Amino acid sequence: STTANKERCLEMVAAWNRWDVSGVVAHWAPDVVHYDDEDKPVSAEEVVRRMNSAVEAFPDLRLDVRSIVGEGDRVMLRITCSATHQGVFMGIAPTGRKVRWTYLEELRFSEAGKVVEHWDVFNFSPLFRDLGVVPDGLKLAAALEH
Amino acid sequence: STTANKERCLEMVAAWNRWDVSGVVAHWAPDVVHYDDEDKPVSAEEVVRRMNSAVEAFPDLRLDVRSIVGEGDRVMLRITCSATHQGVFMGIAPTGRKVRWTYLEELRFSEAGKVVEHWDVFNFSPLFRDLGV
């Protein structure tokens, strides 16, 4: 149901919060499709690579569910992210800075309750309010997205 | 009444697409609260100022609802905006380029179908990086 679907989404966020990427991936159908913010398919390979890099880059990554609504087979979330940049992120040498952004997710679920479709949207206001529009903000924003 | 809230959200997007900011505001309750990223209230006037600038700077602005979900008194929508950058926007001189950005609106409605709370309210507003300057 919708209720189970929402709880599944909280479980994936719980897995992110322990820095456990395969705990997240365990919720995907094996034929899951991942999309851009603009509905273009992104390879599973690249999605996982980005997730791994985030875990290595951000030892204290925290995902704060700010809102969550479900209907039928779909769920959407608004999540505030924060972290200290202490490991390499997508080739970017660690800066030591406190970084924040807003991360927006739409998931569609199969009757069996596995993710069949996933869309990522980012809002980077919090990143540039802080880091104040520096080269660092630009490079990090560009590496967090497809 | 989930159905009706969703329908109200579609009238608001149609109003944006008519470039009619007061058509959107008309859906607000007298005592609407607008929140920014940090849950800090913003004034109706600051919001309207910004919608007015967007409509002025991106005169061919078009919003496309990619999906919409309703639960209880809440609605979220995933919207893709496209426009050409024609006017100065928040001090950014125009490029004439086709520009594109996506955001998720998040609203709560009163029982009579009026917006009473709107979160991350400046999310419709493109950043300089979405404009490539």
Interchain proximity A106–B78, CB inside 8 Å: yes
Interchain proximity B103–A121, CB inside 8 Å: yes
Q: A42: which strand partners?
A: A34
Show contacts of A42-45: CB within 8 Å, 24+ apart: A42/A146
Q: What's the structural domain count of chain A?
A: 1
Residues of B with Cβ-Cβ distance to A35 under 8 angstroms: none
Whole-angstrom Cα distance, residue A51 to residue A71?
A: 27
The residue whose two tokens read 């608001």 is B12
B92 Cβ contact list (under 8 Å, min separation 6): B85, B128, B131, B133
Residue B88 per-residue DSSP state: -
Q: What number of other Cβ atoms are within 10 A of residue A100's Cβ?
A: 18
Interface of A with B (CB under 8 A): 2, 37-39, 66-67, 69-72, 74-76, 78, 80, 102, 104, 106, 119, 121, 123-126, 128-129, 133, 138, 141
Interchain proximity B67–A106, CB inside 8 Å: yes
Q: What number of other Cβ atoms are within 10 A of residue A82's Cβ?
A: 16
The residue whose two tokens read 């159905």 is B3
Please give the C-alpha separations between residue A115 and each of A55, A121, B121, in angstroms, as whole numbers: 21, 17, 29
Q: What is the CATH number of the domain that holds A131?
A: 3.10.450.50
Among residues A12, A35, A13, the alpha carbon closest in space to that of A25 is found at: A12
Q: How many CA atoms lie within 13 A of A99 on its CB side?
A: 29
Interchain proximity B74–A67, CB inside 8 Å: yes
Which range marks the domain in which residue B27 is found?
1-133
Resolution in A: 2.5
